[PDB]
Structure formats: C-alpha cells, structure tokens
Design an enzyme around this catalytic site. Structure first.
Site, PDB file in Angstrom:
ATOM      1  N   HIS A 144      29.478  75.854  65.703  1.00  0.00           N
ATOM      2  CA  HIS A 144      28.995  75.849  64.324  1.00  0.00           C
ATOM      3  C   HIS A 144      27.635  75.157  64.173  1.00  0.00           C
ATOM      4  O   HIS A 144      27.027  75.217  63.114  1.00  0.00           O
ATOM      5  CB  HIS A 144      30.014  75.204  63.385  1.00  0.00           C
TER       6      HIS A 144
ATOM      7  N   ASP B 233      35.264  76.870  68.750  1.00  0.00           N
ATOM      8  CA  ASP B 233      34.064  76.250  68.198  1.00  0.00           C
ATOM      9  C   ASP B 233      33.360  75.455  69.293  1.00  0.00           C
ATOM     10  O   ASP B 233      33.487  74.226  69.398  1.00  0.00           O
ATOM     11  CB  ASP B 233      34.442  75.336  67.031  1.00  0.00           C
TER      12      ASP B 233
ATOM     13  N   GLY C 187      29.943  68.148  65.821  1.00  0.00           N
ATOM     14  CA  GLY C 187      29.759  68.536  67.202  1.00  0.00           C
ATOM     15  C   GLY C 187      29.806  67.364  68.176  1.00  0.00           C
ATOM     16  O   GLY C 187      29.669  67.568  69.371  1.00  0.00           O
TER      17      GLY C 187
END
Lengths: 232, 232
Positions: free
Chosen positions: B35, B85, B180
């Site tokens: 993302h 992800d 992240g």
C-alpha cells in the site's frame, strides 16, 4: 497561546494508560469520542496547561466516577460509520484553571465549516501512553474537506455522513493529534470552537492520502451536550 | 541494539514526503507494504542507523530508479483484509553499511511465531514527514497475538488471515511504528528477523484495545521475495 490539554486514562495492571484526548469545555466537563469509554474501566483525567507547545506548572490528575461518563446513546462501536462518536466526561471535581486560557467554545448548533477551512489539531501524536505529561505538545494545521469533497469515491465515498467533518488527506497529516482529540477552528470574532472530536482514520493509519481524519461534528450534537450538562 | 531504519518517501509539490517505513534486508533491497507504493510516483529512501534509539552519524539518501518498485501481484488496495500487502524496493545503489548493525534477516519460509512472542517495533510514530531524519527513534515491545487469538470474534475476527501477524491490542501501543514499518523478532540463535511489515490498524487508530496492529507475515512471501531479488 495557552491551552488546557486532556488525557483520558484507564486503569489496568495497577497503572493508568492514556487512551484519548478530549476538549476541556468547562472546568468539570470534557468532550471526547464515545469510542474512548467503557464504563467498566476505571478512568481518570490528566490535565496539563501549555503555553505555546510548552508545558507550564504541574499536571492535575482527577478521578472519574462510573456514571459521570456520558456516552452518546446512539454510539455503537461496531459501526463507526454510523457516527454519534461523542461523549461527555464530568470530572469528579473542577480542575483548577487559573485564568490564562480561554476554554474552547462549543460551535453554533448546525454550524458547517467551509471547504478548506483552517482548523488545528493539538496533542501528543498518540505517543504519550501514561505517566508524567510530555513537556511538549504537537499542533498542526488540518484544513477541512467539506462533505462534497470528502464523499468523492476515491476519498471516503459513502463512508462519511454529514454529521462528520473531514480534515487533511493531503501532504499534511493528522498524526500530531490523539484519538478523541479536538479539531479547533477560529470563529469570526476570533474565538476558538471545538468543531470535531477525532473519530477514525483509514485502515492504513493517519497520514494516508485521500483519507482525511474523520471527526465527529460537534455542531450536530449541541442539543444533547446542553441537555446532558444541564442535567448533571 | 542496532538497526537500520528506512523512510520511503514520495515526491509531491517538489519535495519528498515520508510515507512508509520498511526493512533493509540487503544492501540494495527494502521490504515494505504494498500500500506504500504507487508506481507513478517518484521515490527515494532515507536510511539511518540507530543505536539504542539514537542516530549514528548522518542519514543516507538514495534515489529509487523508475521501475525499481515491485508490488506483490495479489495486492489489491480495495481489499486490505485479503492480505498480500507487501512490496520490494530496489535501491539505485547499495547503502553504505560500515559494520555495526547487521541487516534484518528474513525469517525461514513458513515460520510462525508463538503467541506472546516478544517482538519489537521501531519507527518515528508517523510524526516524521520529511526532511532530516530524526535524531531519535521510538521503539516499543509489541507482543505477538497468534492467529487463533487474533481471529477471535471480538479481536479481528474474519478480517485477519493466516498470512498476517498481529501484535499488541492491549496496554502496549503500536503507535511508535510507521505505515509499512517492520515487526522485528529475536530468533532462537539471537539474531533479529523481520517477521512483519505493518499493513493496517483499527479505524480508531494504533492504540486500540483488542485491535492489534496487523502486519503482513513476511514468512508467507519468501518464495516471491527471493524470486524478485534473484531476477532483478
């Protein structure tokens, strides 16, 4: 610029833990997010006065009686997008405020901010967890994104209601605030009104592009706030 | 305790903006969340080596070549709960490593953490937006909540998959990490491994009871990571 900052904390494991900010509107009333409260946990409020972003004097720590917690009757934590994420906390005794700071004003009932309206969030960037208040405060400009823009398909789409305010979602993030933390905006006359209490952010966290922080619009709950304060 | 901290940054309005952390797993490879990547944007990574939460020396700023961002083919931002992800970013040149902090190691393919495993997150708490890397790093113990416990109906339920790691959800906040950002765990041998990259948090944010931060489980994607690195 002086302000009174709020930390709402709950007890677990023989210690209190910060869970939300909030907005001291009266010497014994705090407005915060409903999602901040389970009336089963023991709560206390820690207050700290800031000149600019600098802590002045000592924090005041105030215990809260179960039942001095007033969660909006329509708040449902299983449906954040249903809105109504708002609560009042009556302090068990009045904070001692001196007179340096003019407490944030409740906005006029039904008041809706213009697109791009300059508002501000202040807080500890959710990095404060409990214990002595931080000697510094974070504050940031979060311009509002009106319903028309916020509800664009690539923004919040059908997730937002008109009883919410969106602010940010571009280069500036809303990460400097706290959960339940206030969105303050300058009135015509120049006062500051609490226009929002922080409700929710994207699944990716604060500071995600096109997903502004979503605040509960306080101007949609004036009736209940007044009726609640006047009754207790 | 050493660690190379990564700020992945995208260019907008002529400047670079922090968007995600990640982990430096090779002199010129960073793992991060999918993302975090938009292939149309211009990226650079800023690296800093921290020892006991203090920056050692000065940061290194390394541009990323157009085309050197590799998102997992199954990553779909319309479906966070679908998982996958994860992304790799190849650095246009190798980081200058000296010889203090060894790189984060990848876990064995298929490696599952025990419930309550003492893992750590480190980052800038989403407060670093760009400019010179912060002199100080935020680090926090964030114990693992295994899939059995995390998938409880009152925790994340059906949202979490076996390809994800949960950590936190109680008194220990995950607010120190970045989008992240890595979940680093100690391996039996005493080395540190990246077991997760931060994917999503509850709508209420990073310090929400019974909603641990959810990481992409790195050990579920070792085949893809290895194949991408060997080929590029």
């Amino acid at each position: 610029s002086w302000s009174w900052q709020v930390s709402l904390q709950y007890e677990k494991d023989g210690a209190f833990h910060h869970t939300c900010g909030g907005s001291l509107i009266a010497p014994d009333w705090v407005v915060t997010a409903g999602h901040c409260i389970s009336t089963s946990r023991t709560y206390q409020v820690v207050l700290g006065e800031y000149d600019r972003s600098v802590l002045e004097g000592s924090e005041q720590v105030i215990p809260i009686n179960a039942g001095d917690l007033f969660v909006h009757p329509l708040w449902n934590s299983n449906c954040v997008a249903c809105g109504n994420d708002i609560a009042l906390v009556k302090l068990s005794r009045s904070a001692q405020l001196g007179d340096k700071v003019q407490l944030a004003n409740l906005p006029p009932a039904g008041d809706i901010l213009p697109n791009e309206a300059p508002c501000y969030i202040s807080g500890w960037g959710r990095l404060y967890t409990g214990g002595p208040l931080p000697d510094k405060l974070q504050q940031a400009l979060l311009p509002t994104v009106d319903y028309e823009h916020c509800s664009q398909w690539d923004w919040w789409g059908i997730t937002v209601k008109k009883t919410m305010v969106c602010a940010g979602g571009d280069t500036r993030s809303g990460c400097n605030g706290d959960s339940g933390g206030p969105l303050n905006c300058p009135a015509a006359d120049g006062s500051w009104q609490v226009h929002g209490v922080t409700s929710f952010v994207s699944a990716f966290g604060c500071n995600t592009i096109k997903k502004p922080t979503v605040f509960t619009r306080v101007s949609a709950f004036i009736d209940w706030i007044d009726e609640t304060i006047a009754s207790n």
